């Protein structure tokens, strides 16, 4: 297949080839032009607070250590050894000076550097160069209130400016709340899907909601619970979607603080929500300090998502193109008391972990429509996101990026597909920034 | 068992040894036997009202953890261990069990098969509340669905069971350190 | 069980659970644990001629179903729910067993390896027929053949057993729903 | 590869090249040029009477929807939402007036039309265009006598163009016996074999029986029973073989009514068969007569298989070059008694079912000539099919086709493979014909 | 058992049934069931140091077989017909153990998890020696570690036990023929 | 990959690229140009020594049968039926004097010759030219004092010119001790590795084995325990390295009789060794005698390893880029006591075979450092083999090939890398040899 012309992703993000998401080649052209290119979510402050504190993570297909320095900041490294390539670190986290080889017992310090070689006088004399043998450093690591990103690719943007639009809405729950912190250690699960599946989904799809969530809307009892089996749509201005140059993007489900927290969490979290909304009107504005206590559910771009107040977040883990390894962590308000904090990490894992009973409903879904993807009546057949299209704003006064105002379309998932064709088409940013010059315009069309 | 010379044996796992290593009630491994099979039964036919009325206590405590893999060495790192794939108590099971139950649960059409496999009973009462029993069994789950999905469960329950309403015993605690770190069967929506 | 309320579950499956849930004899539920260890032990070992002489009552009914997915709200489609994977009386379990014993059959060369686990044993005594012993049990069946080939199968099996020729217990009916509709084991060519 | 040129079947169809039952690239070209062109087994009147009943079914990789209409005709479309590509049914069989998709609720017709979309009005306005939203339609659905096909290809030949010579020897027992009926559901298993491998055995494979079924023959007491362990060889004029221009094909086993049924059904059917021949022999001739009440191993190009009179009816379903997914259901005379109906089927899959101990013999045969065809040494060596090669005939005055006037040969294979190269090596069926206009010439050289 | 009419049995495996379907002792199948199970239960912990002083007799042969694919009717070519995967006295055993609890055993961290499923158990008395104990069993052993590797292993378990210091039951053989001729399980690495 | 061009091994082997351990493009080309071209280990004159004995064994992923003829010599073929290609023998060893298909019962010879069709003059007549249907048979089958390879090119160096420098290490044990016996069956295990993980590990590291297998020198009390977590390094003079121009190479550690073997059989095994080198010193003289026993760790290139002493005796049969069955079995000296002989061939299995806890040691390194090579970000890295490199010399007076006289080295792997980047890069022999006219010279540069 030729990325340069082949037409993957058609005018506006209206429509893409079924065969996205099944597709081999297609697959391992990502690895090239989507995940060594582009900002990777590694871990967060939270989990390696102190020095010498590590943990391993995916990027793409790659393993990487992440340590905290003894000056403060983030290094990260491939967990390849560079004599014979072994896996370096067998464990996903932990606390060291440094990492040894099991194979020939090659020493590594935190900091990546070749430190120690098993007697290297006797054996290598003075002509091994160890400075020139230190791990394989991730460029690019940065940081978003704690929320640690790396990126293979010195030439990327810098996290904030790839956030793009989308960081204004993160801003007040990110930010503004006095800081979040993620609770570990993640549940792991492996899924039949491709990666984009979920992430699609999470950028954009309000619609799903009331079907296919039909049984733990009706079971769980969060505020959302109107929605079951259809039974109502959400009122008009009940919320906004948008999307972003770099293809972040969510929706917005105004003032849903307890989000798909059973009945159970509902009254404390809404009241505590409303007690920090009403010192944030005075620092932030009234529409910001909403926006802290709205349901967010939200991509970074390509494939790590959340849902805000609700406290999911979400990794999905490129294996091959019908297998994904899902990551799914807790978020909470650092100055939530202890007990609702672990409560909090408790139910977003009983409604989105390993066995989240909402999380079991979107299986199907997302498994079937990857799978379908590989059968050949169906490769060149197109998915529709064209919802909500010819309705979509720029440069709005109070909302910024490209804005639904609805609560229910397809805008995220057409901005999230215009970044992705964008980038599977070019060969490095500089050519993305020149198909991306006119953005906005082309998911604003009619 | 002394876990400075075993070193791989963990301090719980040790008291948990000792609990049934000690007074050995025949009778009592027995009836813990018919207890888990009938419980067993249930599940697998997809009786999940009848298995809370007959087999689940008011006080339950329904726990599978999932524990980060660390260094065996390792002493520093202190952070959370491990996470709740299930921390449930008799309301929040009865969600999941309404869940399962709903006719808008369109994952469960067409109809799941779950057969379910209990080993290695053992059962001491416990020596401070003489009503409490203790049961330790193994489990293999094998669940089938949609012609060719095929998942299969693999772990160790410890158990507090306790005489509730009508004299019956029942299931007050159970806690289950799931063995696999990645789970490769979709997701773990299953009863251990 | 109110099958009203417990919605997943089936009419078949309330009348068997009512069955065990009554009388327990735990001498029973011993005897029928030796009874199906012993059948495994001689299935397991290839004796399929001492299976069907000790093991196999002259009017088995020895039935294996596979049962077509259908909707959970279905209620108008009315054809066939299952086909017979086996539905085998004793002379057709007896051309069975020629089949494997005979040394054309080239495929039981090498010798095939079987292992048998047995677990979940229930049993009762009919309530109409003193005689007609009824017992449920569950089987992992794992099957090794020509170095790599490796099948393991589930099932849950309702069997009824009576005592014939010199008063042993013999099977005179067994029951498997198979769980799995699209079989990927290559075949089902065992004894379960 | 290149298709066009490379001979993966020598002229005659006396050889072919051992990689086709191994080589991945070769197994999706055939998507292409095997099953998006020809006829391929769907289901039978007998499984969806009633308007609103339907079944799901394979065509090559792909799932089909088969759905009996109100005005009784049947139309099938692709398993596949119009919307987000999640696969729309779940379930193998049932009566339905439409569908609905478990992702965003989308519902369609039994006529594959989109009839409704949750909250149409509040999302997409007067802008979805439902009327081009309709299921992707199988192009080509046709009955051969209640037995249903379908074809992707508008420009396939009718299906009864198709059976060709075939056709003649079926309808005795397809037409003229009253008609058959097909018993479900049927049984599924995954074997680790090409799809050619089956394939080709049921079509021209009379010389395996006593070798391959000697155990079955000798246990079972079947009327073919003579032959185990080739302790006999079949009389002069026991049967013949026959092949058409499409592919399809099938050997003739004289009178072998009761086929490879146990002595336990062997007088009743002796009887019932004899019984309606008799009648026969006044409306369709002696011969004719004959043939209904004789066992018939046949093809239906490429990928259904049958023994008439066994009542075994086989669907071997494509999943990669060593996997196939195998339906077994029994064939039945309309006008036999109920019980005498439910004993056979029975027995079908007593001795061709999931735990069909005849089905078992085969196994290994066909699974490792399939794996062999991966193994660097055997990808380019030849597969015999040369067996009465020069002694077949075409344009006989009493037997149609290409036809080897014996009961034991492969002039059903040759025909089978001279269509397949035909298929693989054109684009259309334009070219196919082209390739196909000397078809029995080819095959009846020396 | 008749070998020379049940064609597919081993003299061996006939030698065995026999041992089994004569006295049956319900109370040492009973001995046998908690014999297993502790043992299993010690193995699963990792309390290998544990296991050896409870469980193993000095005079132990721990023996693991893996058998050649011959023809079933071979009866020419008569060399060597199986390799000892296991074939270990009590010292043998002991560097086993001293090799798992090695702090440098860098293949141990992070801790591998195992579950053990112990069925189908029976026991006899020795005939002619009135302290020797034969159990048989079967186990499936499941093996987890490194986030995504899982290893599953199934056998047929032929046993002697005798009472040693203590009076306390040890093992003083264990035989199993491995089913699986190649291993899929990575190594064979697990105490059976 | 353009395999005429791509450096995928660096000059004089100091590196290469990573993506040889996991490139399935490379595997399928390695077929061609390692497996079917080189010579590989079948059996020995131990395992099939009476006429009619016969092995299957692996060349490749191809299966053989290795058959002693009634000449007394051995003839191999590809265990696969010319007539439609199923798998001709099942079982690992036997006797007989033919092999009879089970599919249609073709019968051949233990010489491989087509011997009898079943019906053959009612069916084929005359027409079946069965000298033409022979198996297919391996073009050069020699022995090694008694260890029988194969190879499929008749272009090939005879084995002994094969083996080059190699054969005068590995003569004083396997012809001047009086001949070894292979003990069989083997162990046969899956490993999720490339096969050229454990060839590379076998030919070449001694650095690794303080490190590695720590916990197995401390617990099992072999000779070679002083070493055991790098507690302490071999003396000067403890042993050598060599290297060979077809790519076989080992290690030599002077004087390790007892090799792996625990305390129970050193005494044994170093007074046994002892008394049959003071013999030997009369015969071959001191240096060679000595060799005798010394611990041999070598690869016969490409994929047979072995280490003298300990016994240990591996095949790496090749099953795909991160796939390898590995056969174990054990060597004795033919005229050791048989108790010793015995206790010796289970001493290799309790350490290196199916449960060998010294061959546990080397799991994760083997598979981790072969999975890594699929990975995106280390594809295009270097594997370092520079150890001892500048130090290496060639023709010494005394011991042969390409030597490095330390215990410890890289030398071996740079040999191994030099002959398999020379076979990938070339179409035949000719080109090979062209490729390979200054290889002692790249080898020992600086
Ligand atoms: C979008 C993924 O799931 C959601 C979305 C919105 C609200 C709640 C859950
Ligand atoms: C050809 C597949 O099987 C057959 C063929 C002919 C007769 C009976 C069975
Ligand atoms: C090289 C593979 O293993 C070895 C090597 C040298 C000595 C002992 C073991
Ligand atoms: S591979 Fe890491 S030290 Fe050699
Ligand atoms: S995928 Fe079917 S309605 Fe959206
Ligand atoms: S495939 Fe071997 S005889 Fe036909
Ligand atoms: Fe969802
Ligand atoms: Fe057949
Ligand atoms: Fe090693």
């Given at each position: 297949?030729?990325?340069?012309?082949?037409?993957?992703?058609?005018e506006?993000?209206?429509?893409?080839?079924?065969?996205?998401?099944?597709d081999?080649?297609?697959?391992?052209?990502?690895?090239?032009?989507?995940?060594?290119?582009?900002?990777?979510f590694?871990?967060?402050?939270?989990?390696?607070?102190?020095?010498?504190?590590?943990?391993?993570?995916?990027?793409?297909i790659?393993?990487?250590?992440?340590?905290?320095?003894?000056?403060?900041?983030?290094?990260?490294?491939?967990?390849?050894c560079?004599?014979?390539?072994?896996?370096?670190?067998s464990?996903?986290?932990?606390?060291?000076?440094?990492?040894?080889?099991?194979?020939?017992?090659?020493?590594?310090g935190?900091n990546?550097?070749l430190?120690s070689v098993?007697?290297?006088?006797?054996?290598?004399?003075?002509?091994?160069?160890?400075?020139?043998?230190?791990?394989?450093?991730?460029?690019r690591?940065?940081?978003?209130?704690?929320?640690?990103?790396?990126?293979?690719?010195?030439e990327?943007?810098?996290?904030?400016?790839?956030?793009?639009?989308?960081?204004?809405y993160?801003?007040?729950?990110?930010?503004?709340?006095?800081?979040?912190?993620?609770?570990?250690?993640?549940?792991?699960?492996?899924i039949?899907?491709?990666?984009?599946?979920?992430?699609?989904?999470?950028?954009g799809?309000?619609?799903?909601?009331?079907?296919?969530?039909?049984?733990?809307?009706?079971?769980?009892?969060?505020?959302?619970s109107?929605?079951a089996?259809?039974?109502?749509?959400?009122?008009?201005?009940?919320?906004?979607?948008?999307?972003?140059?770099?293809?972040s993007?969510?929706?917005?489900?105004?003032?849903?603080?307890?989000?798909?927290?059973?009945?159970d969490?509902?009254?404390?979290?809404?009241?505590?929500?409303?007690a920090?909304?009403?010192?944030?009107?005075?620092?932030?504005?009234?529409?910001?300090?909403?926006?802290?206590?709205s349901?967010?559910?939200?991509?970074?771009?390509?494939?790590?998502?959340?849902?805000?107040?609700?406290?999911?977040?979400?990794?999905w883990?490129?294996?091959?193109?019908?297998?994904?390894?899902?990551?799914?962590?807790?978020?909470?308000?650092?100055?939530?008391?202890?007990?609702?904090?672990?409560?909090?990490?408790?139910?977003?894992?009983?409604?989105?972990?390993?066995?989240?009973?909402?999380?079991?409903?979107?299986?199907?879904?997302?498994?079937?429509?990857?799978?379908?993807?590989?059968?050949?009546q169906?490769?060149?057949?197109?998915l529709?996101?064209?919802l909500?299209?010819?309705?979509?704003?720029?440069?709005?006064?109070?909302?910024?990026?490209v804005?639904?105002?609805?609560?229910?379309?397809?805008?995220?998932?057409?901005?999230?597909?215009?970044?992705?064709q964008?980038?599977?088409?070019?060969?490095?940013?500089?050519?993305?920034?020149?198909?991306?010059?006119?953005?906005?315009?082309e998911?604003?069309?009619? | 068992?002394?876990?400075?010379?075993?070193?791989?044996?963990?301090?719980?796992?040790?008291?948990?040894?000792?609990?049934?290593?000690?007074?050995?009630?025949?009778?009592?491994?027995?009836?813990?036997?018919?207890?888990?099979?009938?419980?067993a039964?249930?599940?697998?036919?997809?009786?999940?009202?009848?298995?809370?009325?007959?087999?689940?206590?008011?006080?339950?405590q329904?726990?599978?953890?999932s524990?980060?893999?660390?260094?065996?060495?390792?002493?520093?790192?202190?952070?959370?261990?491990?996470?709740?794939?299930?921390?449930?108590?008799?309301?929040q099971?009865?969600?999941?069990?309404?869940?399962?139950?709903?006719?808008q649960?369109?994952?469960?059409?067409?109809?799941?098969?779950?057969?379910?496999?209990?080993?290695?009973?053992?059962?001491?009462?416990?020596?401070?509340?003489?009503?409490?029993?203790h049961?330790?069994?193994?489990?293999?789950?094998?669940?089938?669905?949609?012609?060719?999905?095929?998942?299969?469960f693999?772990?160790?329950?410890?158990?507090?069971?306790?005489?509730?309403?009508?004299?019956?015993?029942?299931?007050v605690?159970?806690?289950?350190?799931?063995?696999?770190?990645?789970?490769?069967?979709?997701?773990?929506?299953?009863?251990l």
């Amino acid at each position: 297949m030729n990325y340069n012309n082949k037409i993957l992703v058609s005018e506006s993000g209206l429509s893409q080839k079924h065969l996205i998401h099944g597709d081999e080649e297609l697959f391992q052209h990502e690895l090239k032009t989507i995940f060594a290119r582009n900002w990777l979510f590694l871990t967060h402050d939270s989990l390696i607070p102190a020095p010498g504190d590590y943990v391993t993570a995916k990027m793409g297909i790659d393993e990487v250590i992440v340590s905290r320095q003894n000056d403060g900041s983030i290094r990260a490294f491939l967990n390849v050894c560079r004599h014979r390539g072994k896996t370096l670190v067998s464990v996903e986290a932990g606390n060291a000076k440094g990492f040894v080889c099991s194979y020939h017992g090659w020493g590594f310090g935190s900091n990546g550097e070749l430190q120690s070689v098993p007697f290297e006088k006797d054996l290598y004399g003075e002509s091994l160069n160890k400075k020139c043998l230190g791990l394989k450093e991730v460029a690019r690591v940065e940081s978003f209130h704690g929320f640690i990103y790396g990126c293979f690719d010195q030439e990327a943007p810098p996290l904030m400016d790839y956030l793009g639009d989308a960081a204004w809405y993160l801003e007040p729950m990110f930010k503004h709340s006095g800081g979040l912190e993620l609770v570990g250690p993640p549940g792991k699960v492996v899924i039949k899907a491709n990666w984009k599946a979920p992430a699609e989904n999470f950028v954009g799809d309000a619609y799903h909601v009331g079907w296919t969530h039909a049984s733990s809307l009706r079971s769980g009892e969060s505020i959302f619970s109107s929605l079951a089996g259809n039974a109502a749509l959400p009122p008009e201005g009940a919320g906004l979607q948008m999307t972003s140059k770099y293809g972040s993007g969510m929706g917005v489900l105004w003032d849903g603080y307890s989000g798909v927290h059973s009945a159970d969490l509902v009254p404390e979290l809404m009241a505590f929500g409303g007690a920090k909304q009403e010192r944030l009107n005075k620092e932030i504005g009234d529409v910001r300090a909403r926006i802290y206590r709205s349901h967010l559910n939200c991509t970074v771009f390509p494939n790590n998502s959340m849902l805000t107040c609700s406290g999911v977040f979400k990794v999905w883990n490129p294996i091959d193109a019908n297998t994904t390894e899902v990551w799914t962590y807790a978020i909470v308000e650092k100055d939530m008391p202890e007990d609702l904090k672990r409560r909090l990490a408790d139910s977003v894992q009983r409604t989105f972990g390993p066995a989240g009973f909402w999380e079991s409903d979107d299986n199907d879904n997302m498994e079937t429509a990857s799978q379908n993807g590989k059968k050949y009546q169906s490769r060149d057949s197109d998915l529709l996101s064209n919802l909500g299209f010819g309705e979509d704003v720029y440069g709005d006064a109070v909302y910024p990026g490209v804005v639904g105002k609805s609560a229910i379309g397809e805008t995220s998932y057409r901005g999230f597909y215009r970044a992705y064709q964008a980038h599977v088409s070019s060969s490095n940013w500089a050519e993305f920034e020149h198909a991306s010059s006119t953005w906005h315009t082309e998911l604003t069309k009619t | 068992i002394n876990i400075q010379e075993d070193k791989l044996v963990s301090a719980h796992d040790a008291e948990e040894i000792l609990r049934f290593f000690n007074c050995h009630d025949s009778a009592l491994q027995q009836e813990a036997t018919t207890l888990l099979t009938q419980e067993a039964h249930l599940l697998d036919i997809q009786a999940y009202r009848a298995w809370l009325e007959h087999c689940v206590g008011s006080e339950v405590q329904y726990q599978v953890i999932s524990r980060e893999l660390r260094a065996a060495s390792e002493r520093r790192y202190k952070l959370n261990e491990a996470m709740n794939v299930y921390n449930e108590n008799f309301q929040q099971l009865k969600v999941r069990v309404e869940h399962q139950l709903d006719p808008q649960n369109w994952g469960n059409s067409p109809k799941l098969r779950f057969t379910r496999f209990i080993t290695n009973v053992q059962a001491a009462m416990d020596v401070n509340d003489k009503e409490l029993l203790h049961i330790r069994s193994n489990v293999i789950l094998h669940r089938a669905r949609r012609g060719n999905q095929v998942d299969v469960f693999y772990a160790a329950r410890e158990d507090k069971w306790k005489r509730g309403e009508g004299g019956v015993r029942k299931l007050v605690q159970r806690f289950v350190d799931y063995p696999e770190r990645i789970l490769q069967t979709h997701n773990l929506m299953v009863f251990l």
